[PDB]
Each structure stands twice: as structure tokens, then as C-alpha cells.
Design an enzyme around this catalytic site. Structure first.
Site, PDB file in Angstrom:
ATOM      1  N   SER A 132       0.846  -1.197   0.000  1.00 47.08           N
ATOM      2  CA  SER A 132       0.000   0.000   0.000  1.00 47.08           C
ATOM      3  C   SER A 132       0.885   1.252   0.000  1.00 47.08           C
ATOM      4  CB  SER A 132      -0.978  -0.064   1.184  1.00 47.08           C
ATOM      5  OG  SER A 132      -2.060   0.854   1.039  1.00 47.08           O
ATOM      6  N   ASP A 178      -9.387  -3.917  -5.897  1.00 43.70           N
ATOM      7  CA  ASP A 178      -8.931  -2.925  -4.928  1.00 43.70           C
ATOM      8  C   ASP A 178      -9.762  -1.647  -5.037  1.00 43.70           C
ATOM      9  OD1 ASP A 178      -7.405  -1.161  -3.305  1.00 43.70           O
ATOM     10  OD2 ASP A 178      -5.572  -2.277  -3.765  1.00 43.70           O
ATOM     11  N   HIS A 210      -7.750  -4.938  -1.458  1.00 49.61           N
ATOM     12  CA  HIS A 210      -6.537  -4.243  -1.032  1.00 49.61           C
ATOM     13  C   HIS A 210      -5.762  -5.013   0.031  1.00 49.61           C
ATOM     14  CE1 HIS A 210      -4.029  -0.686  -0.846  1.00 49.61           C
ATOM     15  NE2 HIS A 210      -4.186  -0.594   0.464  1.00 49.61           N
TER      16      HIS A 210
END
Ligand code: NA
Length: 261
Positions: A132, A178, A210
Site C-alpha cells: 500500500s 482494490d 486491497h
């Protein structure tokens, strides 16, 4: 003896890359937040054996608001194939991607120069990974430190979409579904901006969210290991997984085609 001095472990198979553990038994040690200069501490995973030579090292960053526990499974998974791996905490959980990039490099600096396992690391063969905003930090670290041997951003997030100066082999892993760092505005723009002269790949996880990188994932493990082996170790035994072709078959000495069709 193999011509490549960085080859570790037996010849790889799909089975051995998909398994929960590689050929090397793993030990762990930790560095406190206070001892960690320029980052928030971490856990170090390393092969216990040293008798095949030193290893490349990898630093892994978590994402926004997250800690080591969100990336912990990567430690044993990757270290068991022959790497020294540090899963870091950041200075604060709100650090932005460019701050995480500096902390990745600070963690590598610690491993090479001050950690108790520094003597089993080849300081010339280093890599960065992250989830991320930690994956955004991975891209910035690769851009600012071209001596890195590999970079693997996992469902990356970054406001900068242009990575056209990255000269480190980069595997970007995106998650199809995502909604937090959508691949249409993050992972794919990043991959498309990377130079075509840089070895690179984009792997999209079918149906994934995600948070796919935060738990054991056969596909993320398989291709991350193959990428680190191919580029941190120059280990061309792993090209067969990154660039499959029919001539990988022992019965086929050569295969040419006008693929794709
Ligand atoms: Na610190």
C-alpha cells in the site's frame, strides 16, 4: 560448482515455490524502536544456515495505519528461500509514502552495518518491498537508490504516477478489486510509466481486495520469491516462472513462435 556464485538451494519447482516454506530453516531476532535509527524497529528473519554463502537482504514496509503484523507472513516465507528479511514498523503509522521510502533504506542500512546477522548479508545485493503506502515507498526508494537489485510494490498507493526514472527490476502486484488503491489509478499507471528497458512485470490478483497482501497468499509468495531470486541473486533458474515457455519442458530443446495468438 554453479557458475553463478549467488545460487542458493536446489533447483526450483512450481511446487517448492507454492509451498508454505522453502528449503532453509528460519531464525528470527528483533530490533527495538529505540535501537532502530531512522525507522520504527522491526523483526529480522534469516536462514539459520550459513554454509552456502551470504544472502541478499530485503526490507519490507507496511501501509498506512498498519504495523508489522500486517506483513509478518512474508518474513518466514521469503527468508526460507535464502534471504535476510526485515519487516519494519514505521516512525508513526501516519507516515506518507516518501517517508516510508527513507525508512526502508534506513532499515537496510541497519541490517548491513549494525544488526547481529550482518555477517550473513551481501551488502551489494539489497531489495525493497512494501504494502500500500509502503509499496508507494518501495517505488520511491527504487527511483532514488538505483543500486537496489529488486523492488516489489504490493497493491501500491502513491500520489506520484510517474516512475519513468526507475532503473531497478520492479514487479508490481495489483489486486483486481482494490477500492482503496484502485489499479486503474495506482498500480497500472505506475507499471505503464516504468521504462521498457527496465526488467519489469505487472501481476494482477484475480478477485482480490486491497488486503490480499496481509495474509498468506500462494501467488504473492511464488512470484515474489521468483523475482527476488532472479534479480537479487541473478538466479536464472527462476526465469522459467517469470517468462514461461514450452522449452522449459525437458523434452523440448527449442521453441519459437509468433505468439501471442
Ligand atoms: Na527508531
Amino acid at each position: 560448482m554453479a557458475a553463478n556464485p549467488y545460487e542458493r538451494g536446489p533447483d526450483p519447482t512450481e511446487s517448492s515455490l507454492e509451498a508454505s516454506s522453502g528449503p532453509f530453516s528460519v531464525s528470527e531476532t528483533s530490533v527495538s524502536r529505540l535501537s532502530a535509527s531512522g525507522f520504527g524497529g522491526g523483526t529480522i528473519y534469516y536462514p539459520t544456515t550459513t554454509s552456502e554463502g551470504t544472502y541478499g537482504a530485503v526490507a519490507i514496509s507496511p501501509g498506512y495505519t498498519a504495523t508489522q503484523s500486517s506483513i509478518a507472513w512474508l518474513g518466514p516465507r521469503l527468508a526460507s528461500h535464502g534471504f535476510v528479511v526485515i519487516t519494519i514498523d514505521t516512525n508513526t503509522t501516519f507516515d506518507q509514502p516518501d517517508s516510508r521510502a527513507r525508512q526502508l533504506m534506513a532499515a537496510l542500512n541497519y541490517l548491513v552495518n549494525r544488526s547481529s546477522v550482518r555477517s550473513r548479508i551481501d551488502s551489494s545485493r539489497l531489495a525493497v518491498m512494501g504494502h500500500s503506502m509502503g509499496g508507494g515507498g518501495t517505488l520511491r526508494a527504487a527511483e532514488d537508490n538505483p543500486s537496489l537489485k529488486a523492488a516489489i510494490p504490493l497493491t501500491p498507493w502513491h500520489t506520484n504516477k510517474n516512475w519513468s526514472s526507475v532503473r531497478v527490476p520492479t514487479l508490481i502486484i495489483g489486486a483486481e478489486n482494490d477500492t482503496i488503491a484502485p489499479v486503474s489509478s495506482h498500480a497500472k499507471p505506475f507499471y505503464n510509466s516504468l521504462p521498457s528497458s527496465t526488467p519489469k512485470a505487472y501481476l494482477e490478483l484475480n478477485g482480490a481486495s486491497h488486503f490480499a497482501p496481509n495474509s498468506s497468499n500462494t501467488t504473492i509468495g511464488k512470484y515474489s520469491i521468483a523475482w527476488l531470486k532472479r534479480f537479487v541473486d541473478n538466479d536464472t533458474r527462476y526465469s522459467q516462472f517469470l517468462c514461461p515457455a514450452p522449452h522449459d519442458d525437458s523434452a523440448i530443446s527449442e521453441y519459437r513462435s509468433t505468439c501471442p495468438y
